Symmetry: D2
């Protein structure tokens, strides 16, 4: 009933330290006052790491140039999923780190992560040698490893998308959903889950497998989710766990970004699920 | 930046005290070891209140007779939603109190509640004079009122059900879902949300409005959810907040229970949403 | 088993808010890295209140002038008692607020307080209408009132001083101590308590009564404790609770400060105990 | 900024597990309701370990025989130092384990420990191969090792006793105290510390060194502290750390107990300090 503690490691080190320190602060603070507050906590923790030169934030129009300067670029969403504060659904924080220099392909990521503020604050992190899952130990004030080299199932049994947009679906989404509900091979239909908070839905996709979609649709031809600080980081994590992440027409990490608040479609998860979605597009 | 504390009140009092004490213990402990553990914490907290005579638990075949005896009956589900432990989705605890004497109509409830183990542990409670929402303050070890007399919206804009069971839907569910996605009156389609944990989905239904369904279907003609300790308590809370709860053919609280682990269909939420569902059945 | 919360009140308001916010941060962080850290947390919380113009800190040679400027002066000791970090003895934080303008008599204090970092973080605060005791509720992140208008006993039964300095005592300390151990009126001797951390010893003096001494001695003719940010604040709190605080030759709050790091002797507590000490000096 | 956890080990194992589980509960609960409550938590945690046959508690007249029976005896004080609840001084819990069978010499201890409820809950534990110090991590609900094989200084510079009992001192205490205040070898006098809570004073003695005394005196010829569940356990811990513990006339661990609530004098700490005290007795 007793434990020993040991330091763990995956300038980059100091940067992640400070990004984790901001996440701890965000955790405890979990209204748009909250967005404003989360934003400043990340920007000032990150600047003071002396590890950054450029930040892109979901809450700022323009890139933020550090005075304190280091070699890394960070694109982040400091608080995502806030339309769910009341229902205690888990909101999250998303970040990707690079060496504008924030308009690089996701291919170039050196580190990325998300935090999920649930009954425990969980962080998925990767530095390019797999995904590790941590939980925040608020007593210690430190992140404790819970799962090393997390791998996603080859094929799952859950599909995750807002089916209330059915009337707006493109033809490949319509087909794919039809296949999940009415399998043509004698298998049982997939179950459906959709929390409405991207980090909560992605995290479930990692740990139980299956597929998550926020595809193009009639109302939103480029999707809703943001390339630099939502889609690229989760595509990186999911790919490091053995999954796939596509826009429908190319890998998310291969998209050349055209603007820092650019949106793209996002389909990710277990690889054989994503590949079946892609087969619906090719038609 | 400073506060004062005052005691709040809605034998019954001692019983709720002990039910709240079990919820605190359950909270902190959030594998079927966990189910076993939650079960014993509730049974022994409840027996020692000296306020009970009969308990029905989701985890026990037979009713449990208290040796210590008082005037109240309690039907409870000590831990619901466990298929979601990993994805940090909020699991819950559900209870209803009555004065077998556990086979009474929901109409006879004297008190009911749920707890939702999210980033905060929230409890919805009613003693028949509305719904109050509390949060667990683990420092104090006590529940703090956050919202008095919670009211549900007359009509919402979210529908909540596993649409992966489409191939098994009865005709009224098929129609209703079709209406939410393809409104015939020029309105925008409803959004869809489904966490897959009944307390998390019901709680969202209370606080944002709309509708939650686990109706009859081809695989499960009596639904999945359990009348005594899942459906009746949430129907009571939702009705105390101004909503409705139906099996499709009658109010949940009016169903005469035939066995303590009986299942029924469950459709609840904003009243005009439920009434529109009922209009799909009458056809 | 349930509670309601209500806001409590004693520019000044914003200042105390920020001083309380620094105390929360200090609490959690409880090595001289820690001193450095506590210092910056107070200085930057206090500056940003936009309520200050001058700060005196135990850790800074010179007064710190705020750029952000308001009407209040604050003398503080951000972390006192650190020679006791290991033995879990409670360390503290001490502050006094005024309207150099930090060289005012204690008579001029508008507010003062201490925090004691024990199993709970306790704050004694006064704004000149008595003393209120609060505990930090780290869940809420807020201070909860536990005792209103705290009054110290007229006479206690504990005396508190480092008796290992006996060989250095001045004659009045020698006499007083002799009286506590060998009462000449048939009463039992006082008990002795000395934690070696000024805030822990003062706090015990408030809540149980008796007397606390760090008098002049041969090694230290002006005592050890610092007038601006140790002695004046605790003299203010203790006097607001009905006690007395003397240097041996005058009330602490009447001493005209000659330098911001000036030391003075300190004898405080229950009034009849202090008056008996003063009777030993007059001889 | 990240950590990994590993299980640590020093029927005996299950017993310590349950003793640690009681300490966690006691911690959080920190009035004699509290004594009653702490007592029951230990007795019922300990019985259910299925590792015990006999318990001696400070709060029970008679030994408690377990129905559930195992090979170990436990003498404990579930809550000590309660006259200090207000002043946040650390109260503690003390226990010793043996294989009446509770009237054994301290020499026979198989394990012993104390917990100190300060800003962190600390446990000193030994199973006969030195002392290890742990802190309670309430988030994890588990004890984390902070210091392995703790050793006490050969000689310290603090002496700890209620000097308000001077008029009642026996001649050897009078002499020893005189030596600490007026060293005859040109050295500086020792400093004095006395919190008035035995576990807080013993713990300081371990971690900073020096000496702690609750000797015989005129009012109390057998001292105050209790042999089975106060004096023997701390003598065991202190001796495992390289110190000494004497009654003045023999080692505490060598005293043959005559009754389960027997008192003895207690002088412990750094060995050269204890030996100097013993030199004052031999005269």
């Amino acid at each position: 009933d007793m434990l020993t503690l040991t330091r763990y490691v995956m300038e980059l080190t100091q940067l992640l330290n400070s990004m984790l320190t901001a996440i701890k602060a965000i955790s405890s603070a979990v209204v748009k006052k909250l967005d404003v507050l989360s934003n400043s906590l990340v920007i000032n923790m990150l600047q003071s790491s002396y590890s950054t030169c450029v930040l892109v934030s979901e809450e700022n129009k323009d890139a933020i140039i550090t005075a304190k300067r280091g070699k890394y670029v960070v694109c982040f969403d400091p608080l995502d999923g806030s339309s769910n504060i009341d229902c205690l659904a888990s909101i999250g924080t998303i970040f990707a780190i690079y060496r504008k220099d924030a308009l690089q392909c996701g291919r170039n990521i050196v580190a990325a992560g998300y935090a999920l503020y649930g009954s425990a604050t969980l962080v998925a992190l990767s530095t390019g040698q797999g995904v590790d899952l941590f939980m925040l130990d608020p007593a210690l004030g430190e992140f404790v490893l819970v799962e090393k080299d997390v791998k996603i199932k080859k094929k799952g049994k859950i599909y995750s998308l807002n089916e209330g947009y059915a009337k707006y679906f493109d033809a490949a989404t319509t087909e794919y959903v039809q296949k999940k509900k009415f399998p043509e091979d004698g298998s049982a239909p997939y179950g459906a889950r959709y929390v409405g908070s991207m980090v909560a839905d992605v995290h479930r996709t990692l740990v139980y497998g299956g597929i998550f979609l926020y595809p193009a649709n009639q109302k939103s031809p480029k999707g809703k989710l943001r390339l630099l600080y939502e889609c690229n980081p989760v595509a990186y994590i999911i790919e490091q766990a053995g999954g796939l992440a596509t826009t429908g027409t190319q890998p998310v990490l291969d998209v050349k970004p055209e603007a820092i608040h650019q949106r793209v479609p996002l389909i990710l998860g277990s690889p054989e699920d994503v590949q079946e979605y892609l087969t619906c597009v090719q038609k």
